Structure formats: structure tokens, C-alpha cells
RNA sequence: AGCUAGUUGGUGGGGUAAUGGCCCACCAAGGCGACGACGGGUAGCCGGUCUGAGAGGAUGGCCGGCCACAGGGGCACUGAGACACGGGCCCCACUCCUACGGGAGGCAGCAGUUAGGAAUCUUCCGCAAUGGGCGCAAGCCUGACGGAGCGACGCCGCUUGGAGGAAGAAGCCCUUCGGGGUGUAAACUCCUGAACCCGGGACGAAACCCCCGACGAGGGGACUGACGGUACCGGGGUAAUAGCGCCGGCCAACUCCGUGCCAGCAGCCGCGGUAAUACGGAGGGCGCGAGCGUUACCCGGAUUCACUGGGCGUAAAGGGCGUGUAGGCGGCCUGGGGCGUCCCAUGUGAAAGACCACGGCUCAACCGUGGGGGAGCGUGGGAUACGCUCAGGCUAGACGGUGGGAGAGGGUGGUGGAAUUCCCGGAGUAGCGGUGAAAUGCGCAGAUACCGGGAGGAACGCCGAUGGCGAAGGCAGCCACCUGGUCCACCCGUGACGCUGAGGCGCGAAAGCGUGGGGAGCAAACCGGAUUAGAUACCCGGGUAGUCCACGCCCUAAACGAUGCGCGCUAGGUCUCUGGGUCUCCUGGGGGCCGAAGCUAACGCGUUAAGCGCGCCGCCUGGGGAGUACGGCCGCAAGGC
RNA sequence: UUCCCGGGCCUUGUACACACCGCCCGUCACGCCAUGGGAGCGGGCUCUACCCGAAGUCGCCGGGAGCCUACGGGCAGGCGCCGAGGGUAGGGCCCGUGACUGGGGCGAAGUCGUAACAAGGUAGCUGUACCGGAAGGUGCGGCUGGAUCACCU
RNA sequence: UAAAAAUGUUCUGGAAA
């Protein structure tokens, strides 16, 4: 019955990249597309696309990695190293534009939902808005 | 614990226990010796530790330890008790401040005299 | 864990400056509570202060705001204001006077005493300044206040000297008896001059007031200093205090002698038993210095109550299991609302403190001026992604339908055979039984062994397990009836109806308890025989409760996967039970083993997670004491929670 | 080559590591400390009821009885409600005590045995139940955190 | 999985390394 559609998606992405899969499916929902659209723009994924899995609407995320490596364990490093859900249904989290976190000293992105749509920390900051803190990624 | 449980029960504060009641919050406390005896130490050790059972003003009767070599205390001497237990003497949780009230200092003490209530001697 | 009679509301009054059950009649039965009422303990609250990376934690002394009290307790008067600290009345306790009938007082004002305590100050000077009351004013009063005093109680500043001065006195200490160390340290030589001495000597003070002008504005004039002959300036001027802790590791600093588990040390680990950097002294060294240590308490370190920021298979930690109340949490599309949320403006956020810049005391401490933050909360305006709410829509969750399946799932009633025991009838004779070996025991009153018959109770061999069913406990011959769960297929219906679940309710092995029944075998207790140093055991022979049934209790466990429930996601291999198939093999549900990724302290776990995530619940916080005591609830008791 | 003594290699269990000449459990005896129960006593706080009830405000009355009068009134007085405080009785919470008693912690070299750790010499642990100087034994049931060869998958 | 095998007690207090 999925208590949290979003966390679920973040985890699908996480569980997939960890076994270096090429792409992963996820039940589709407008708000979810927004998240992906951002991870897309920001370079964490190669991109998403609306597909259809046996009658029902799913989103197909295309994962991205680094180059193969030398030494033992040539597995490439992840582009999406970390992706944690900040606000959970068990306890929401909202931040004023002045309290918006800085993820990984800059090399990280934070995603938040605002009246002005779903934007990244950087945008929200340059928009003077705050909102619910969806998740952070680096 | 899930946040909902923390909301419902919350975390519990520590609450530390005094290793030195009988002092009732004071740094020191006065008392009268009702028995100045000689007890045998805990295990690894062997000796005849000089300890006195003191009747405190704070309404407590506890045993304290008499620091230094040799003392002058006898039944009914008035002393000033202080924090500080002695590991060997089980049950002994306070020391006797040397050089206050009826507790004389330690005769011929040349080092760390301050801790044994003895005056700086005149240079011979 | 339940509390409530002025109790909760009403109507009309009394009362007050004013609302009000504030108080009073009369009427109504309410009001409050696990979102913790009622009760008990503790406590004045705040600005702030200490600590902390922060979030927090601790705290509330001095200064500022608010409240409360004025020996304990009640009360009113006067009044703009008090139910009044140096006003009043009354009672009480205690202190004192009395001509014994009634009198007097209240330092939690300043100072001082005494008691208590580890411990906390002068019965100082002045209204000169600021502030207050009264006065037209002069001015009066002001233990507010401005000052001085005492206390290293704290912070800041200063001094105990500066430069020379030996391949290096003495003394003391070591020593491989050459020497090393104290040590430029001293002495000694120059030099400066804390103190003290003489002289001068404030700022804080310009207004009230008087005079010209109208006693307005403006101008002019006079008085006034407690601190104090103090600060400060000039001149003169003497080498002029040093201590406390520590030196095994943590932790900077080592040698000799004394001591011999003694004496002693000790924050933790620990030192001491005749070569002790750990005790005591010495020499030496390190740290700090008008101080240095000690004790006490707070924060830190302690992500060791984990919001930031922890955990529960074996370390402490998953509830014995269901069902479910409150509560928490909630799939997909669309629109209204705009409570959460976010944004702008605006009001508030006192001062002091903190921070920053600059100044004033020779610096600093202190201190002034200015500057910048700021959550909260009020108001107006706006946003609508997410949460919430309303409405419409959806079918992927969930439930239902139809057709099927497996099963020691449960309850009830029957019934079948093997065996043990006892009884009866045969037949037969000297032992049987038991053990490491035996003895007790049964047996010539005929046992054991054997055949036939009967009675009775309990459990169901093979099948049969790496099996199956159940939420758990748990369930095993067979048959019938009654009944639960569950799985698959078709995808037919409903349309989020869901997940979890503090309490509650139900279930809950064995032993145990109550009434009654039943009693073959087994068997606590108990009695023998052996064994042994003993033998309340183990081994042997007996044997009661109990084991069995009914109905009612009890509610525990290594109630175990020592692994809460649900959902999604993340290689495979292999065996197996059960269903479907376009039955090489695939697909759904279940039971095992090995193992990708990942996880773990390791062992191991790994699509039956101990991996990766979300929701909800339970639980943990070093070891004993102790699942003990006390209290409460339960129980017939044992006991349980 | 079963057995006794010593010893090699592998393996298994371990709570041993001063390493089985190890470890270690419980009663009994002595000392100390804290604590529960205990005929009961002594307090503190606090609740209920009823009795006496100061001052005082607020209601009557103010008359066969005074004083004032701005002579409608007012004051002094008298009655009452409430009421500090005492008093009598009974509860509730807490504290201190008490002959005696239960168990507990701790304490260099005490007595008895040997339960556990190696099939610890009866595998161990466990709920319960009865029993026994003591550790513990036994009954029923449960767990593996117990079990050589073979042997079955 | 199924799983037989032993009559026989005990070694004062510190400190080794």
C-alpha cells in the first residue's frame, strides 16, 4: 500500500544504481516526475520517460555511472552517491528560505516543494522561497 | 523509537547520584568521632588503615579516613569531614581534613604539606 | 486514576471602579480527566548566567521587570491608591515594664548581636552629586543614594629588580672517584629607584536663588565637595616578598637514601612482601605565581536518553499469540477552500548583558557613545508544490463473486487393531526378574515361559519426512457430522473500504488448583535393595498424587527463528510440498539448503534479509541487589502482572 | 595395543590462560553496612463532621432605655450571618522509631560437600511441582545455547 | 536427520609473565 511513494522512488533509484542496472521502473505520479525532472536537469540521471507496465503508468528512470576502473573491483563509481529522504510522512520538515540547507558544501543538491513548484535549493534560494524539504542528493 | 513514540514518551534525563551524601550539599561538614579504630583493607592489600566513625552535624553517622602517618584523634575529638572515599576500606566514603579542629597536622611533613594541614617550617 | 455541591450552567438580586458563582436566593444537572483531571514532592517567574560546534543541558546570586510576604493568622478603617514593612483592631506564641487593672514591641530597612552553619562585612562619613516627599521660596527630611571601611571572594594591572659577572667558590646532591648538578644562580661591580619624604593639589558644580529683560526666551552674578590634602603632578629617594601543586601511565617533570603487604599512597589502572622514577626525606625537575592545591556542585567530553545524533539473532533490548478501541500513518487523476506551509510589509521583541566599531580612567578590568542581529507572537497583503479539508473521477492496495485444491487446523459422536496389567480355564516345573556385579522382589500356597477366554484403561506401529496444517500454544488409527484459516484460476463486482495498534477482549504447552468420574501403563513424594567416606542421587524392586475425561480455575516457559506486523525495492543455483499452464519448462503460494550486491564486532544473514526504504507498536540504557521489597490489580491456593 | 604411565599429529568442547596441581556453586560460622516484616508505639502534613467562637464588614432592630438633630434622620447600643482561632471524634499520605525476624552487599589465607565449566564424570538449561544439610535431585513438558562410528536423504 | 560410550573427592592468600 506504499506508505511513502516518494521515499519508495528514491530507494528504487538507490537499490538499482547499487547493482549497476541500466534503468529502473517506478509507479508514475505527477509530483514524482517533478523530482526526476530535476535529477535529470542536475545530471544525476541520464533522464526519465513515461512508459507503460502491463496496463499501468510507470516512469522509467535511466541511471548514470562513471567509467570502469582499474585494480580489483572495476565497478564504476556512482553519480548518485547519496540520496536520502529528509521529510517523511512520519514527521514532515519545512524550511524558511533562510534555513535552506547547503548539501555537500555545494557539490550537492537539495530538492524542495514550494508554492513556486518543485525546485532545487539553489533556485529556491534565488526565489526567496522555502517549503517542504523532499530530499538531498549528492 | 519512531518519532511518534518520542512525542508520546520522549527521552528520559539522567539524574546523577551523590557519591557523598551526609555532606548534604556542603563542601565539608563537621562531626564528632564516636570511635577511632583501625580497619583492615580490601583484597589485594594488607595494612591497618586508621579510620574514625564520625557523628555528623547533618544528622549522619559515617566512617571517615584519617590521612597521613600517625594522628592524634581519640573518641570525641571534633573533626571536619570532606569528600573523598578510600578504595580499600569498603564503606569508607569521606576523608578527615587534617589541621582543622581537633585534628592536628602531620608532624615533620615536608612535601605537599598543604594537603596534610602542616605549617611551612622555619629553615632550621 | 478517577476528581467535583457553589460543584457546572441559568434567572433575579447583593457587591465592585468594572466583568464574574466574586457572594446569595431559586431553578437545571452539569463541569473536569490518560491531550494526565485529582493527589503527593519540589520551586518565586523572566531579561539573563554557566557550559556547549550546535541542538541542547544546568541555573535564576549581584543589576533590571513582574509577583508574593512584613513574628504566625484573620479583618476592616482612611484614602486617587493599601485590606497598608517603621498605620489600626483582634487572637496566638515569645520578649520586656507594672503600683498586678492593664501596658509595650516585631531589623525579610541601615549598622550591629546571638543561634544555626563549612561560611558571608562597619553599631563609618555626607546629603557635595543623582533621585524622592512637602514648600511660592528660603529650605527641611532622605541608613534611597554618593562615598569610605573589612575579607586575595572574584576579575584586571603592578612589584619583589636591571646589565654585567668563572672551562664555573662554597654548601648540599649525585658519581663508571676523572667528574656531573644546583649555576649567571650567588658573591662582586655598575645601574634604575616599589616604598617612603617635602611641596603643590583636582574633575565631579551649575543650577535652584539674586539682577537687567515681563519672575518668558536670552544675558550676568553669588553660594555649595562627604570622598580628601585622596587622585594626580613636581622634586628627593632605599635592592627592596615567594609561595603552592606536581614528577609510574593517563600528564609536563628522576635520581639517592629510609622503609620492607609495615608505615603509607590512591581520580582510574593500581603502588608497598629487603635495589620502590608510585610510600617518607633529600637533591633535582616540571607547572603556575600573590597565589597554589583540596572538597562540593553545573555543563563538557558522554552519539552514555541519540531532534541534530543510538539501538534490540548471540552483547542490555521483540510483547507468548490473536482480534481490535483511542491514536499515528495514507495509492492515482482533477477542481474549490488556503488551516499547516512559504513569501513581502508592518507592530512588538524595554534597559542593562552578549557581539562589533570608537572612545574615557597612563593599560586593563571596569565604563560611555554608536552600530548590527533576533526567533516567537499580532495585523494586512500574496503563493498553492506538499500536508490537510470539500467535491467529482480512477482501479494498481484491500474486500467481494464464480469454479476449483491440499492439509495430524478446531469441536462432537462413533469405532479398529497391536500391546501392557489383572481375572478365569488349560498345560507345565524350578526358577524368574534384575545388573558393572548383585541384592531387595516375585515363585514349589506352583511364578517365569505357553495356548484359549474375559475385563479395563491409555496411546495409536508401518505410512512418516529434508513432509503438512495453525496466529501462537499446538495438532498424528479410522469414520461421520459440525466449523475456521488458506491457495490457485477466471478477472466478473465494489471503488482506498487501507497499515499498525496504548488500553480492552479472546486464546494460551507442562506442572498446579476445585467438584465429579476414571485409573492399564508410567510415576514426583514415599519405602526397600544396592553403590559410596556419606548417597535424602545416579542403578534395581515397589509406590501415591498426577498423567486420562467433564465443567470451572491458573496464565507461566529456552511461549525460540532467542529475529513484532504490513508494504515496495535489490543475481542466481538447487531440493521439496501444493495449484494453474500454450504441463522440455513456465507461473502463483509454502518448506529447506548454498550463495550476487549489501550488512555484521565476528559468527553469520542474504527475495522465508540480519540488505535497501516508509508506516505503526513493544522494548533497551553497566554488573550485583532483584523480577526482590513496598503499594496496587488478579488468583481458591501455588502464585501472576 | 583394549587397560595403566609419558608422548607425537589431526579433530572436538571449554566458563581454563597462575592454563585441571585450573575453575567454581550453595548452605553453616564470625564481622560490618544498608534494607523488608514486626505487638506496636512518637511525630508531620492533610481531609470530614460537630461544639465554643475574637476583631471586622455586611444585613435586620434601634424599642418600656440614652446622646445629637441639618427634627425625613444619625450615633451609641442589642440580635443575627460569616468568621481567625481553639476543642471533641474519625479517616488519608509521609517520616522516625520498636524485642524479634527475612533475606541482601561487602569482608588475605574458617567448616561441609562438589552442582556447573571438558558425554565435568547422571549432557546442560528451563516453567512447574514435590523433596533434601547445602550446592541440588526427581516428576511432567519444553529448548539446543548437547550429543562418535555407521547410516538416510 | 538417528546418536552409543565414564564407580573414584579435593589442591590456603598475594605475585609470575
In chain B, what are the domain boundaries?
Answer: 1-124
Strand order in the sheet with A23-27: A23-27, A56-63, A45-53
Distance A44 CA to E5 C1' (A): 69
Entry resolution (Å)? 3.1
Report the run of H or E that residue A112 belongs to, with start and end: strand A109-114
Q: Per CATH, which fold does B1-124 belong to?
A: OB fold (Dihydrolipoamide Acetyltransferase, E2P) (2.40.50)
**Nucleotides of strand D lying closer than 7 angstroms to a protein CB:** 32-34, 105-109
Q: How many CB atoms lie within 10 A of CB B13?
A: 6
Same domain, yes or no: A43 and A58: yes
Q: Which residues numbered 36-55 in chain B sit less than 7 A from strand D, measured from CB?
A: 40, 42-43, 46, 53
Closest chain B residue to A91, measured at CA: B3
Task: Report the largest interatomic distance among the alpha carbons of chain A, rounded to a whole angstrom.
Answer: 49
φ, ψ dihedrals at B86, nearest 5°: -115, 115
Same domain, yes or no: A72 and A92: no
Same domain, yes or no: A29 and A42: yes
Residues of A in contact with B4 (CB under 8 A): 90
Same domain, yes or no: A92 and A76: no
Whole-angstrom Cα distance, residue A121 to residue A127? 10
Resolved by = X-ray
B83 touches strand C (CB under 7 A): yes
Distance B81 CA to D57 C1' (A): 60
Asked whether the beta carbons of A85 and A6 are under 8 A apart, the reply is yes
Domain boundary (A54, A80, A106) is at A80
CATH of the domain at A52: 3.30.1370.30
Give chain A's length.
Answer: 138
Domain boundary (A80, A109, A127) is at A80
CATH of the domain at A111: 3.30.1490.10
Q: How many CB atoms lie within 10 A of CB B103?
A: 23
Q: Which three cell numbers stand for residue B10?
A: 520522549
Per the structure, the complete domain to which residue A110 belongs is given by 81-138
Amino acid at each position: 500500500m506504499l506508505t511513502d511513494p516518494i521515499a519508495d522512488m528514491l530507494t528504487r533509484i538507490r537499490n538499482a544504481t547499487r547493482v549497476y542496472k541500466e534503468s529502473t521502473d517506478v509507479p508514475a505520479s505527477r509530483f514524482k516526475e517533478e523530482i526526476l525532472r530535476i535529477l535529470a536537469r542536475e545530471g544525476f540521471i541520464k533522464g526519465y520517460e513515461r512508459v507503460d507496465v502491463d496496463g499501468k503508468p510507470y516512469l522509467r528512470v535511466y541511471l548514470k555511472y562513471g567509467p570502469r576502473r582499474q585494480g580489483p573491483d572495476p565497478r564504476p563509481e556512482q553519480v548518485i552517491h547519496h540520496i536520502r529522504r529528509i521529510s517523511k510522512p512520519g514527521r514532515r520538515v519545512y524550511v524558511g528560505v533562510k534555513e535552506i540547507p547547503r548539501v555537500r558544501r555545494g557539490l550537492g543538491i537539495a530538492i524542495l516543494s514550494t508554492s513556486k513548484g518543485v525546485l532545487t535549493d539553489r533556485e529556491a534560494r534565488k526565489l526567496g522561497v522555502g517549503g517542504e524539504l523532499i530530499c538531498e542528493v549528492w | 523509537p519512531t518519532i511518534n513514540q518520542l512525542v508520546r514518551k520522549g527521552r528520559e534525563k539522567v539524574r546523577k547520584k551523590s557519591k557523598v551524601p551526609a555532606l548534604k550539599g556542603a563542601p565539608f561538614r563537621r562531626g564528632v568521632c564516636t570511635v577511632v579504630r583501625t580497619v583492615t583493607p580490601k583484597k589485594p592489600n594488607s595494612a591497618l588503615r586508621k579510620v574514625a566513625k564520625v557523628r555528623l552535624t547533618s544528622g549522619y553517622e559515617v566512617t571517615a579516613y584519617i590521612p597521613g602517618e600517625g594522628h592524634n584523634l581519640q573518641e570525641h575529638s571534633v573533626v571536619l569531614i570532606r569528600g573523598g572515599r578510600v578504595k580499600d576500606l569498603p564503606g569508607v566514603r569521606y576523608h578527615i581534613v587534617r589541621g582543622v579542629y581537633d585534628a592536628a597536622g602531620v608532624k615533620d611533613r615536608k612535601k605537599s604539606r598543604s594537603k596534610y594541614g602542616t605549617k611551612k617550617p622555619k629553615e632550621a
